Amino acid sequence: VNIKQFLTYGRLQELYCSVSEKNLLHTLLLKKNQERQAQLKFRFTFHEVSKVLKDFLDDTCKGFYQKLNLPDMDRRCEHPWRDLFLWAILQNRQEMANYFWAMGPEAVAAALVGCKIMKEMAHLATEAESARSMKNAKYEQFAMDLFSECYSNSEDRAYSLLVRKTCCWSKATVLNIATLAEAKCFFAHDGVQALLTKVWWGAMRTDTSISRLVLTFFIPPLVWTSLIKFNPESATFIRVVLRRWNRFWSAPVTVFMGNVIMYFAFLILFSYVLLLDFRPPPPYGPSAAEIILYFWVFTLVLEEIRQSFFTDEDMSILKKMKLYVEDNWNKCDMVAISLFVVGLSCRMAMSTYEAGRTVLALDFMVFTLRLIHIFAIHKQLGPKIIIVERMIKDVFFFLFFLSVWLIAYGVTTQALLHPNDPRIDWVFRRALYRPYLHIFGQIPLEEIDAAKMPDDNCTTDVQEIILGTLPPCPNIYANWLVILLLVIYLLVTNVLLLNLLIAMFSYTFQVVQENADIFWKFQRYNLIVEYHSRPALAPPFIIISHITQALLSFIKDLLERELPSGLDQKLMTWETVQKENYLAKLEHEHRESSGERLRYTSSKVQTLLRMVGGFKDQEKRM
Amino acid sequence: DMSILKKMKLYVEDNWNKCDMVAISLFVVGLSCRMAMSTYEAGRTVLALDFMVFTLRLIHIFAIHKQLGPKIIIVERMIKDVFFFLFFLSVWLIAYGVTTQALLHPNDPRIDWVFRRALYRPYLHIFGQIPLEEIDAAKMPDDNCTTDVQEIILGTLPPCPNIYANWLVILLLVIYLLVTNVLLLNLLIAMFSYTFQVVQENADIFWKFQRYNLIVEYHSRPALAPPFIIISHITQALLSFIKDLLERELPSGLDQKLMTWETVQKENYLAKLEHEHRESSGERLRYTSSKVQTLLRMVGGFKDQEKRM
Ligand SMILES: C[C@@H]1CC[C@@]2(OC1)O[C@H]1C[C@H]3[C@@H]4CC=C5C[C@@H](OCC[C@H](CO)CO[C@@H]6O[C@H](CO)[C@@H](O[C@H]7O[C@H](CO)[C@@H](O)[C@H](O)[C@H]7O)[C@H](O)[C@H]6O)CC[C@]5(C)[C@H]4CC[C@]3(C)[C@H]1[C@@H]2C
Ligand SMILES: C[C@@H]1CC[C@@]2(OC1)O[C@H]1C[C@H]3[C@@H]4CC=C5C[C@@H](OCC[C@H](CO)CO[C@@H]6O[C@H](CO)[C@@H](O[C@H]7O[C@H](CO)[C@@H](O)[C@H](O)[C@H]7O)[C@H](O)[C@H]6O)CC[C@]5(C)[C@H]4CC[C@]3(C)[C@H]1[C@@H]2C
Ligand SMILES: C[C@@H]1CC[C@@]2(OC1)O[C@H]1C[C@H]3[C@@H]4CC=C5C[C@@H](O)CC[C@]5(C)[C@H]4CC[C@]3(C)[C@H]1[C@@H]2C
Ligand SMILES: C[C@@H]1CC[C@@]2(OC1)O[C@H]1C[C@H]3[C@@H]4CC=C5C[C@@H](O)CC[C@]5(C)[C@H]4CC[C@]3(C)[C@H]1[C@@H]2C
Ligand SMILES: *[C@@H]1O[C@H](CO)[C@@H](O)[C@H](O)[C@H]1NC(C)=O
Ligand SMILES: *[C@@H]1O[C@H](CO)[C@@H](O)[C@H](O)[C@H]1NC(C)=O
Ligand SMILES: [Ca+2]
Ligand SMILES: [Ca+2]
Fold this sequence. Notes:
The structure is cut from a larger assembly and holds two copies of chain A.
Chain A lengths: L2 H4 L2 H9 L6 H16 L6 H9 L25 H11 L3 H9 L4 H18 L4 H7 L3 H15 L3 H7 L10 H8 L2 H4 L2 H12 L8 H9 L16 H15 L2 H24 L12 H22 L7 H10 L1 H20 L5 H18 L11 H36 L6 H15 L23 H6 L11 H36 L1 H17 L9 H14 L9 H27 L2 H28 L1
Helix pairs in contact in A: 3-4, 5-6, 5-7, 7-8, 7-9, 7-11, 9-27, 13-25, 16-17, 16-20, 17-19, 19-20, 21-22, 21-24
One ligand YUY sits at the interface of chains A and B.
């Protein structure tokens, strides 16, 4: 059977129409068909398949079947193994999909696509057993093992395989598909990390010492010395010195360094303006340092705009905005920008001056916390960010129990101690703020224990309590009960509930620390990619880079590169050979396994018993 | 006798050696400053720090005991954990402290008090020092306070804390207490627990290496303890001018006998390894499958020959 001749588009559509009607793919195709019928022979059509694929990849299946809209039904599929793999993946058939992947040309990209589709469908997950089998798909492992084989083979063709635009997946890069699939374990591969290190250092050699690089950063003229080794490849002298300067000052590591230093400078200036040089409204004018801070934040806004609208390429504006706002650091920045603008606006008026100063203090808090993202560069600091996020989630869930318990205890103690205090603010103080402070050692027994209550001048008159002339007299009717409740609260809260939260923290830390390497390598990938696409200048100076880019656009890649047809075909054949070698080694390993040997021995012993019995009977005939 | 530079490099490679060097330098600087009236207090301060260094130097003798040795390594790794935790702690404390200083004392110009309220007070919150009389308006005393900047700088009266939005200051303090005191402190403690677990898994090996190092260190030391060690030093110098348990040179016959003995021991060890490998389950399975294959082929041939008859 020749699959190239066997699989026509009509045949493929017939296969898509022959879905068992008990699996998720049939339901999804039914929903697509119902939507199409509402908006406007074969039960299902390639339009429905394209829409279903769009709900899992949304960029990869660009005109897989919409190109001709519908293609000729007697025409053979241009990518038969790709189509068969996609069809066998959409319906949770993993063995068949494994076979189709083993016969397919672009296997790393196919495996990453399969892992993405498996996780998205396990998010859909109509059933639960299918969802569990689809959680353990092991396609990212196929991609990782094939790429390990490829990287061990050549280590230079592996990088090109990482960055080349695929032919079977609509010019999508393997790294693009891994990002779409969120394949954290693939990004943690040694080959991917090596390519990331090569991108990180740029023109310099990756073995460059940190001390030499920092010292050359702080002494720019020393870059023309041989202190920093660079990778191979009047007017000439100027050109070569400019080339050396640009190659050093364009590397993502130096851009990162400069951005970190200028962010420290920005925080220092922000703190100076907020704490020492915050002047009255424009009647007495903002200080010059404040205007410098305004310009700095304006350049930050320009950088945000560049990242949200003019990032790297041309897509839908809405798609680019969605990609921008999907990053949590991006929305953190947006919050900081909005807070600064509101603060500045309120500060410009006398009646809102204090509110503006308050909002600006909160904005400094937000910017300082924003500074945290640079810790992903270090293995010992990166994973702790993820730990802190999960631990914040743990705190959020613990807060339900804490709030219920504190409401009960605080209202009971407020009723027992100050039944005649009408003021609501003091009600909430004594009911929640004081019990919360008990957790951290703040136990004011002079307000709770009668024997410790001072002889202060106190009133029982409600009007005098409301007026605030004298503090209310605490009720000591049954003070033993108040003290017993405080003892119980101290035990329960401070030991039991606090250590329940701490045990939750410990479990979270243990779970993240088990996978610390993978998490940090994914973080490092994201940080290196972020600073590789950034302009070489740090804000405020980034205004120069923005102006230069705009002027270049008006007047007139390391990753995701397009290859010549011959080199592309050579790479595809090389990867196919690597996949064949990997599968052959897997088969050989399987054959020599203990279970396989046991099965072979038992079967052959059975055959030997039968044939030896026959031979013995024949001999006994003689 | 080696290269002088090699011996110095070997000396300074030991952390206890550089600890001692720090202690000696501190004592010398302290004594020198103490010799002058204008540097007397600085000398006393440096000598106090030197006592601290010497007392911590005393820790090295704990390697002699199995229950004390490994704890030194645990403490070193835990200090590294603290160093890495300090980045998060410093960033968070800078954010919170500057925000609260701006909210509470926007008119206080003095930088020392800025840094006090921005980092020293929030750090002390971690250890139960929560002065609500400076943060909560309802707990603020009726003390005699000024809003004049000149009077604040002069120090005549304490500055009046700003109570513009005190609910926000209190909410920030509540959030800081939760985040820092529970979350971040227990993140550091979980790091500590992981470090302790990793070292305690290999406690025996670490302590035995420590014991080796300590025994070797005190085997090569002169028999007299300082100050008295001056007598041993003078005796050694006099012996050098006028005129080993480990690392000993053997006669040629005994050396050859030892080499042959070790070769025989290695041969016995390798033979036992080979015998263990042969009788393993996997090897037996491989042998049985291969011989069953051979038996199938040869029995088929024999059966065909019999069927010829
Ligand atoms: C292992 C486990 C640990 C936890 C726990 O169980 C065991 O421990 C138990 C111990 C127990 C507690 C044991 C004892 C008591 C005392 C008892 O009061 C007796 C009531 C009498 C009558 O009403 C009040 O007396 C008098 O009051 C006056 C004030 O009103 C004081 O005058 C002061 O007045 C003014 C003070 O402002 C000022 O003029 C002066 O300062 C002074 O003149 C007198 O001096 C004092 O004599 C109340 C109960 C209490 C606190 C127990 C509570 C429960 C425990 C904590 C257990 C735990 C589960
Ligand atoms: C489970 C979880 C725990 C954590 C938390 O969430 C839930 O708990 C919540 C509880 C909440 C708090 C609940 C209540 C409040 C009170 C509120 O003030 C109301 C504002 C008004 C108006 O501006 C001020 O009032 C008045 O001020 C005056 C001072 O200025 C006082 O006069 C004093 O003046 C001088 C004091 O020097 C002296 O003359 C005397 O001593 C006295 O005359 C009055 O007596 C008082 O009436 C501010 C907010 C706060 C603290 C909440 C903050 C957030 C919580 C902790 C929640 C947690 C997330
Ligand atoms: C963590 C939750 C948030 C929401 C909430 O409980 C904790 O906060 C508390 C703060 C309370 C305020 C505190 C002070 C005052 C001033 C007083 O003159 C009138 C009542 C009012 C507004 C109170 C109304 C009820 C409020 C919002 C409580 C509310 C359930
Ligand atoms: C753990 C870090 C060490 C470094 C540092 O932050 C914590 O220490 C802080 C102590 C600060 C001092 C404290 C007191 C004074 C006296 C005052 O009249 C002038 C300013 C000055 C020197 C301050 C300058 C800034 C300093 C070094 C801060 C500096 C970022
Ligand atoms: C309490 O107020 C009354 C009002 O007359 C006064 O006489 C008395 O001295 C006050 N006591 C205290 C402790 O302030
Ligand atoms: C505060 O200082 C003024 C100066 O006249 C004085 O009259 C007043 O008694 C002082 N109050 C306190 C509480 O020291
Ligand atoms: Ca951003
Ligand atoms: Ca020494």
